[PDB]
RNA sequence: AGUCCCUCCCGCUCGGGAGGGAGGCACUCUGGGGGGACUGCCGGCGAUAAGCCGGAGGAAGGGGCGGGCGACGGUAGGUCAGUAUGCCCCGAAACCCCCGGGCUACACGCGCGCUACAAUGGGCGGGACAAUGGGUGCCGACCCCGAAAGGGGGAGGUAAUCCCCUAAACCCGCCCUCAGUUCGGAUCGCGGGCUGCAACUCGCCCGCGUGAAGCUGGAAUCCCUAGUACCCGCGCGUCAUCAUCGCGC
RNA sequence: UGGAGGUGAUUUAAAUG
RNA sequence: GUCGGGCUCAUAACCCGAA
């Protein structure tokens, strides 16, 4: 199936996974511009090592974070879209290197479907799922309310990535649609602004209940 | 070029593909119907996979020679799912490693250390070797980083 | 004739490489470095010597043997010798620079260890215990 | 429609319920109070040079202790 | 939270006053002194009177 | 690892590999001794004290990281069914032995787990890389026989020497394509073995057949801050035989 | 240092041994 | 109203499921 020239791939340059350069790569949003990490890196394995530092993780390679976040069952101790996805011993916790593998297929995918370059069209997807406005919690007369507030940037760039992994792992929970395919549909789905992205919608129900609690 | 400049697998099959010449190999008239280890659960799914296990073994002769019956059995084990108790490892069976090997002697090809188990004759590491020239001859066409070796 | 020696560490895996002058070839435990499975492991090894360089790459053969730990541990401390290696023999400090600014574990190593395992639960780690009930 | 951005300038302190909200100065550096000094309430770690994206610029936080 | 011992400061205190030409601005030298004007065994205690030490030095040098 | 000799392979040998012997202690490792980190240096806050916050250099930075060691007491907390011991009892039985049963019963309520409800998979063939420990009432390579479980001989080992010991999760190729199914493997029939004085009550293993509930879980509620949690196998204890456990890797 | 007065306020429900 | 489970040191109140 897969030809002899791609199992024994040899790179020669530096470029993320030896297929793609993020030289043209723009970053819109002033706020999240010093926190989407793009310096030119082969592989996208740092090891965990900048978890024990504050603000370690703001100089991690994107396409590492996003690796990280599909590494993950996905429905544990709260419902997505209505259910829990408990996968237990067939998840991916723990396996970096399938991984690996579905981040790079999906974005064959990507590049195909749309003829540009994939980190350019995650870098879009991610500034559209990045909301700017929250809520924190009260309580009064055993009722709990709500009131608005802002959000940091890494806090919008940690929700944008967990809601677009999150979406990927709805859309392929016991239907005949991949995993790859799955990411790659979320992705451009809200790249464009669909309302059929699960982190789009997410985005706009969050500002949504905020708007309405000032 | 030698048996440690081709991928493992890739030689495997050549190699069984040139061993249904030798009219020293053939199946047992048990083949048909049995598995190859209790941790298995069901028969093998290619009408010749005979040959393929014989390659294995005589591959595994070359590079890890002297080596007998236990240790091979080993290598051919593996996990096995116990209903609802969690999976454990185990051996393979005997009476297919030492068929394989008792016919690959009849050919010539491996020999008996007394008290050390089995190695590889010249013949059979003639055999080996072009087989895997030929093999890397044509992989690096499309591998061009392969000549310097 | 120059031969130089050099050691990597990582996870209990042990890596000894030798480099001499040569043609191009490095080989991990007798087998050329182009072939090696998983790509992640493959790319793990490969990273200094596309940072060094074409020129310096096709004159120099490289010999790795590595024992002990695991498909990751091993590649990672081949990674830390062949890196070693190669600014220890060219002997110049913009290459060595350039490794520190990418990557500084390749020339200072990684000193982590698995934390050893308490009561409570022994088996599954340091930390995680029995679920708790009270009724 | 696409907001304003905002720099932090300086720190004051932590608030809430259970002390997840930061109390921040900012400057506006856009729009109709371009250079107008504000604090405002928010979620998430930040530090001084961070950039807010505020929706509207005349809702001001009330000062804590 | 590092907080100086107090049979440290006792110690150091009377080393510094019966040498007060013997002790200067330089670790290394204040701990060969402390190894050689005691009989501390332990190499991290060493540390911990040369260094405090070499802060009464600058104290009492700088006039406090 | 470099160096000398011998043998065998390859593209027939300019070159590239694999064994064996001579030789060496370089490298890895083993284990005795020593060095190294002190808020020592730099800039702020605080008082100019005690200290705190941020930088350099560094293998390591602020109890460096993980463990052992738990004050005066209390808790009429647990233990006389480990051993010691006062009183009260039995003292031809409540002491000492032997045989067969029982602690393994089963409308039902509860704790802690294992296996799943599938594609972030199941099956079939092929390819990779560990560490801790243990062995003479024993570990057993190697050969032969058997489809398997197992059976018949048996080198070496009182052990850095010989053995348990070529882990699984992972990678490649083919079948299955969202179905109570090539998911799941409970339950039961027939047959073959091992340990033991004894296998029905009441043991463990293998082959063919059989194919239950389960399609993600209400109110509630647990563990965890880094080589940690999750996921994966392995060693030892117990032990004649028997691990869904404990302690460790 | 330590005292005496005045005016304002007090964010659901929560019994028993 | 009956039965079962949660919450509490425990009971009552309160929450959930079922016939
Ligand atoms: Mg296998
Ligand atoms: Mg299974
Ligand atoms: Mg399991
Ligand atoms: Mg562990
Ligand atoms: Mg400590
Ligand atoms: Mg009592
Ligand atoms: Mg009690
Ligand atoms: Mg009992
Ligand atoms: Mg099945
Ligand atoms: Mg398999
Ligand atoms: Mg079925
Ligand atoms: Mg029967
Ligand atoms: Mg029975
Ligand atoms: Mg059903
Ligand atoms: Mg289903
Ligand atoms: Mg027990
Ligand atoms: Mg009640």
Known sequence: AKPLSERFFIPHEIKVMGRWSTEDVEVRDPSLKPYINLEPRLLPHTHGRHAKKHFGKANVHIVERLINKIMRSGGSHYKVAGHFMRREHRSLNSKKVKAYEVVKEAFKIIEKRTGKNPIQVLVWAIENAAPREDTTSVMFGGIRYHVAVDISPMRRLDVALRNIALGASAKCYRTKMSFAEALAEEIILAANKDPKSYAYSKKLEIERIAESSR | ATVYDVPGDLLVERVAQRLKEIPEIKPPEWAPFVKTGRHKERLPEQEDWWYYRVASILRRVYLDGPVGIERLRTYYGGRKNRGHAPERFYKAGGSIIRKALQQLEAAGFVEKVPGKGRVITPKGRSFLDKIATELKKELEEIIPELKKY | ?135 | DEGYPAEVIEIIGRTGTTGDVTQVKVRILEGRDKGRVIRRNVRGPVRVGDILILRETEREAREIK | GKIRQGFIKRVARELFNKYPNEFTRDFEHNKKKVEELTNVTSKKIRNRIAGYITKLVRMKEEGK
Do not use: C
């Not at chain 3, 790319?43 to 730990?69: H, M, Y």
């Not at chain 3, 088996?123 to 708790?132: E, F, I, N, S, V």
């Open chain 3, 1 to 135: 004739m120059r031969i130089i020696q050099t050691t990597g560490k990582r996870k209990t895996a042990i890596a000894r490489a030798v480099i001499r002058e040569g043609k191009g070839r490095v080989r991990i435990n007798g087998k050329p470095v182009e072939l090696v499975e998983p790509e992640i492991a493959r790319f793990t090894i490969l990273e200094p010597l596309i940072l060094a360089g074409e020129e310096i790459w096709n004159s120099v053969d490289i010999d790795v043997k590595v024992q002990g730990g695991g498909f990751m541990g091993q590649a990672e401390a081949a990674r830390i010798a062949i890196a070693r290696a190669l600014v220890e023999w060219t002997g110049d400090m913009n290459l060595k620079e350039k490794f520190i600014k990418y990557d500084r574990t390749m020339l200072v190593g990684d000193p982590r260890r698995t934390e050893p395992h308490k009561p409570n639960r022994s088996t599954k780690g340091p930390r995680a215990k029995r679920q708790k009930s009270y009724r």
